[PDB]
């Protein structure tokens, strides 16, 4: 993936933007080295407390001469340390405004010139360049890839040099003070990167196997939703639900393995982080015991190295943001640097006046550059004498339109020469050229502006008086005048749609305004019917009067009155002459003329997973433990420094600092066990909830009727997505988020409680400014997203002008209006440009005031905290403990509330799951309430049934349809397409209810008989039968659900469908997998399986719907024999398409407009000599 050099990317900066980028980079380095200085003054603050700490305790613990010398020393030293803390934050307030504003002001002034030069280069392209390049991706390149550059050269460079100054300056302070513990952290640095790097890929390794585990269940569900008409008509709802539930166990058992492994993967690196941290504090405590370092020398280099090691993680997104900006600028700068051979914006060529319009084509050859493997013109020669009209004829797309594109000079011919008045048209400039040429296309492009402006597009200075004259002359004036806002009416894409005749005359009026000396018209007389075209023809004839004209003629009447005709065949004029001459020639032309928000609440989600109590009970308890343990790690950190600040001999310091080093690993064993116990109980709760919800929705999806599945919104792809996405996004909000919140409720709970009993003064200061810092972290996300919605609304006005000019480029290049849309694109960009110089002002203030309140609160914490030490109210270890336990418990509740909006993604997924389960269908298939008699006649009767489809209830399909089928007889339904032949079969099924009328079976209302026992006595033979991925034995046995049926019952049925002999010689015979996975069966073979399935069921009624619709002549007769067999003693309804087949049917119904126009036996309907007779003939 290519990119640009870095010197070529900033070529639109200028010497003022170079000033902005360098001063902002200087402030980026100043702000980056600020935090290494913050840990330097922090370490010197601890050394001043430790030097007066051990002296005041090891000799004269409470005195007067000892009290006056150390507390007055602290009041002068901590004032100087607080002068340094405010001095950084006051300097950062000036600096952190500069580093982002100057880099976003330089990015805003560059991109604003990049957008104008990109769109100027697009209008400067060739038209053959638009043929080889896709125009849909080009209009989106002007919107997407320009935003990719502005991310790269914006504030992301000022934050990159901010991170690199903390990488170097954090390591400079880490080396120029200690240079020994720094090598210890750099030795354990590859151990921590390998621990989090070898388990992040194993976590993605079990992810792709978990997606492979569910993929067998989603393929089963997609097999049933695509076979929804076949799974309903056989009653296989409880069978396919069990196949989906037997496959749901695989994604639950592997989801347990995905839950056990992903907590061992998290817990092992969580232990190895604590192993290297406790070692880097046990090594730091063994060098202050050895009296090489102090307690402030170790704390300075331990933080500034870790801050410098963390700076490489906050700079790698800005490296990829700069590399993606260079990769996006490679295609953009390629268009700006592209200089064409046809420069549309050039003022170069000649300008001849007094053009009489002599036209000459000489030996023209031409090839389009999107298909260069053929020639369009092969020696095309022709003169147009001044003021004459020339009509071009010959078959569609033979080269006629090609001529008009060459006379526009919209391509550059290879061989030959095009001249106007003896002068090569390639030696004047294109804009003067096209000004002299009026193009009337086949279809006219009208722009979304007023009628006055669309006409004025031909020549922008024309007065409205002169406009009025042209609409008259073009014959469009009276039609425009019959409107309320006539010349101000807005035409195209937004306004009133004009007819074809009226649209073309506007183009004619536009061309009149241009008043050219040459006219080019292509397929003008073919936009609509002769009613509209005739007025246009009068107006065409007007526009031509005394102009040299080339017309691509489609209508014979247009061609006959022309002054000269050219006859084209294969690029070559085979004959040319007047009308009478060409008739005499009897060539091509002569041949022509004769031939011619959600409803789901929190209590509804909790009620689903309420069946498993004790996995939640261990889960809430372990998060309270791990939440309560989190301030306890700041306790052991406060007691390690508390040893070397209170005072003691350097032989109890070994046994005290080796006790606290083991206390990290006492908690480190507990925090590893309580993290596995937290994630196993919630992980099993997340995979129980995913399997149980997918079972209940797929049960409620199989209980619906067929009218629910005919909806365009409830397609089979959108149904398996809701079954997969919305049911897996509920385990991402129950197990993972409750473990996090109950930790932070216990973290900010106990971390306040531990800090309160270790001093009530400093907690009230920290718990007052932390919500002020946390509110400022929220308002900065609402003003950034608020300015993002304001800027993206003002940028769509400019992008609408680019969309209208790029999509209609073939029309705007013939009107010489590339400069007009470029100025409109520039004038629409002034309001986003004024908001861009203000956006850097807003980006600078919110970034400066966040870090100002981050350093002034650090100043106010230790200016108030040092006053608590000098009055003997707080130990320095207690000031450290109140500080460390609060800011880690508040970082827990502050970062998670920005991550907490996943609940809104889950409640709208829960409401989709709730509204599918709670939805009761119009026809409940699982209902046990029905008559269910023991009568096996199967008299079918439709009486006056009236029915409309629920998809489109505006078109009537069946009206007053009445017919009886007597026991054991066959009834055939026939008629024209869409008459409701198929519909009758679907109603006997009871796939839909009727609007009016009644459907009976043996005298009984089918709405009063159980749907299961209706469909059990119905054999459905579909048009194109759906075969399931399964053995031949199971697919056939599928017809008789809930029953013992074996190989014996399968084999007699397979005989009588005529497939036994093919099955018995096939490999693995009745076990052979068919479907998409298995051996592909022919069309004929597949349908007979559906027939065989109906035999096992042994119904008293047979529904046959347009079978034998294949193009296999012999197979059909094989099928038809098997079908004749199955019918002989069964009551049968066949939707008949093969007229010869319908000979042996008992009764035939001929349907017309929903009703029974006629009926009878075959012979009687023939002798009637009506509709049926017409069909069979």
Coordinates of N, CA and C in Angstrom, one line a residue, residues 526-592:
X526 N -36.5 10.5 -29.0 CA -36.9 9.2 -28.5 C -37.1 9.2 -27.0
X527 N -37.2 10.4 -26.3 CA -37.5 10.4 -24.9 C -38.8 9.9 -24.5
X528 N -39.9 10.1 -25.3 CA -41.2 9.7 -24.9 C -42.0 9.5 -26.2
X529 N -43.4 9.4 -26.1 CA -44.3 9.2 -27.2 C -44.5 10.5 -28.0
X530 N -45.1 10.3 -29.2 CA -45.3 11.3 -30.1 C -46.2 12.5 -29.6
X531 N -46.9 12.3 -28.5 CA -47.7 13.4 -28.0 C -46.8 14.6 -27.4
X532 N -45.7 14.2 -26.8 CA -44.8 15.2 -26.2 C -43.7 15.6 -27.2
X533 N -43.2 14.6 -28.0 CA -42.1 14.8 -28.9 C -42.5 15.8 -30.0
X534 N -43.7 15.8 -30.5 CA -44.2 16.7 -31.6 C -44.0 18.2 -31.3
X535 N -44.3 18.6 -30.0 CA -44.1 20.0 -29.7 C -42.6 20.3 -29.7
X536 N -41.8 19.4 -29.2 CA -40.3 19.5 -29.2 C -39.8 19.6 -30.6
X537 N -40.3 18.9 -31.5 CA -39.9 18.9 -32.9 C -40.0 20.2 -33.6
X538 N -41.1 20.9 -33.3 CA -41.4 22.3 -33.8 C -40.3 23.2 -33.2
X539 N -39.9 23.0 -32.0 CA -38.9 23.8 -31.2 C -37.5 23.4 -31.6
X540 N -37.2 22.1 -31.8 CA -35.9 21.8 -32.5 C -35.8 22.5 -33.8
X541 N -36.8 22.3 -34.8 CA -36.7 23.0 -36.1 C -36.5 24.5 -35.9
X542 N -37.0 25.1 -34.9 CA -36.8 26.6 -34.6 C -35.3 26.9 -34.3
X543 N -34.8 26.1 -33.4 CA -33.4 26.2 -32.9 C -32.4 26.0 -34.1
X544 N -32.7 25.2 -35.1 CA -31.8 24.9 -36.2 C -31.8 25.9 -37.3
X545 N -32.7 26.9 -37.3 CA -32.9 27.7 -38.5 C -31.7 28.6 -38.8
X546 N -30.9 28.1 -39.7 CA -29.7 28.8 -40.2 C -28.4 28.4 -39.4
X547 N -28.4 27.3 -38.6 CA -27.3 26.8 -37.9 C -26.8 25.5 -38.6
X548 N -25.5 25.3 -38.6 CA -24.9 24.0 -39.0 C -25.2 23.0 -38.0
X549 N -25.9 21.9 -38.4 CA -26.5 21.0 -37.4 C -26.1 19.5 -37.8
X550 N -25.7 18.8 -36.7 CA -25.6 17.3 -36.8 C -26.6 16.7 -35.9
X551 N -27.5 15.9 -36.4 CA -28.6 15.3 -35.6 C -28.5 13.8 -35.8
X552 N -28.4 13.1 -34.6 CA -28.6 11.7 -34.6 C -30.1 11.3 -34.6
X553 N -30.5 10.9 -35.8 CA -31.9 10.7 -36.1 C -32.4 9.3 -35.7
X554 N -33.4 9.2 -34.9 CA -34.1 8.0 -34.7 C -35.4 7.9 -35.4
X555 N -36.1 9.0 -35.5 CA -37.4 8.9 -36.1 C -37.3 9.1 -37.6
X556 N -38.0 8.3 -38.4 CA -38.0 8.5 -39.8 C -38.5 9.9 -40.3
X557 N -39.5 10.5 -39.6 CA -40.0 11.8 -40.1 C -38.9 12.9 -40.0
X558 N -38.1 12.8 -38.9 CA -36.9 13.7 -38.7 C -35.9 13.6 -39.9
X559 N -35.6 12.4 -40.3 CA -34.6 12.1 -41.3 C -35.0 12.5 -42.7
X560 N -36.3 12.4 -43.0 CA -36.7 12.6 -44.4 C -36.6 14.1 -44.8
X561 N -36.8 15.1 -43.9 CA -36.7 16.5 -44.2 C -35.3 17.1 -44.1
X562 N -34.3 16.3 -43.7 CA -33.0 16.8 -43.6 C -32.4 17.1 -44.9
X563 N -31.4 18.0 -44.9 CA -30.7 18.4 -46.1 C -29.7 17.4 -46.6
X564 N -29.2 16.5 -45.8 CA -28.2 15.5 -46.2 C -28.2 14.4 -45.2
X565 N -28.1 13.1 -45.7 CA -28.2 11.9 -44.9 C -26.9 11.1 -45.0
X566 N -26.3 10.7 -43.9 CA -25.2 9.7 -44.0 C -25.6 8.3 -43.5
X567 N -25.4 7.3 -44.3 CA -25.7 5.9 -43.9 C -24.4 5.2 -43.4
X568 N -24.5 4.8 -42.2 CA -23.3 4.1 -41.5 C -23.5 2.6 -41.3
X569 N -22.4 1.9 -41.6 CA -22.3 0.5 -41.4 C -20.8 0.3 -41.0
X570 N -20.6 -0.2 -39.8 CA -19.3 -0.6 -39.3 C -18.3 0.5 -39.4
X571 N -18.7 1.7 -39.0 CA -17.8 2.9 -39.0 C -17.6 3.6 -40.3
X572 N -18.2 3.1 -41.4 CA -17.9 3.4 -42.8 C -19.1 3.9 -43.5
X573 N -19.1 5.0 -44.1 CA -20.3 5.5 -44.8 C -20.3 4.8 -46.2
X574 N -21.3 3.8 -46.3 CA -21.5 3.0 -47.5 C -22.3 3.8 -48.5
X575 N -23.1 4.7 -48.0 CA -23.9 5.5 -48.9 C -24.4 6.8 -48.2
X576 N -24.5 7.9 -49.0 CA -24.7 9.2 -48.5 C -25.4 10.0 -49.6
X577 N -26.4 10.8 -49.3 CA -27.2 11.4 -50.3 C -28.5 11.9 -49.7
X578 N -29.3 12.6 -50.6 CA -30.7 12.9 -50.3 C -31.5 11.7 -50.2
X579 N -32.7 11.9 -49.5 CA -33.7 10.9 -49.3 C -34.0 10.0 -50.6
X580 N -34.4 10.7 -51.7 CA -34.7 10.0 -52.9 C -33.5 9.2 -53.5
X581 N -32.3 9.8 -53.4 CA -31.1 9.1 -53.8 C -30.9 7.8 -53.0
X582 N -31.1 7.8 -51.7 CA -30.8 6.7 -50.8 C -31.8 5.6 -51.1
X583 N -33.1 6.0 -51.3 CA -34.1 5.0 -51.7 C -33.7 4.2 -53.0
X584 N -33.3 5.0 -54.0 CA -32.8 4.4 -55.2 C -31.7 3.4 -55.0
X585 N -30.7 3.7 -54.1 CA -29.6 2.9 -53.8 C -30.0 1.5 -53.2
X586 N -31.1 1.4 -52.6 CA -31.6 0.2 -51.8 C -30.5 -0.4 -50.9
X587 N -29.9 0.4 -50.1 CA -28.9 -0.1 -49.1 C -29.5 -0.3 -47.7
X588 N -28.7 0.2 -46.7 CA -29.0 0.1 -45.3 C -30.2 0.9 -45.0
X589 N -30.2 2.2 -45.3 CA -31.3 3.2 -45.0 C -32.6 2.7 -45.6
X590 N -32.6 2.2 -46.8 CA -33.9 1.7 -47.4 C -34.4 0.5 -46.6
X591 N -33.5 -0.4 -46.2 CA -33.9 -1.6 -45.4 C -34.5 -1.2 -44.0
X592 N -34.0 -0.2 -43.3 CA -34.6 0.5 -42.2 C -36.1 0.8 -42.4

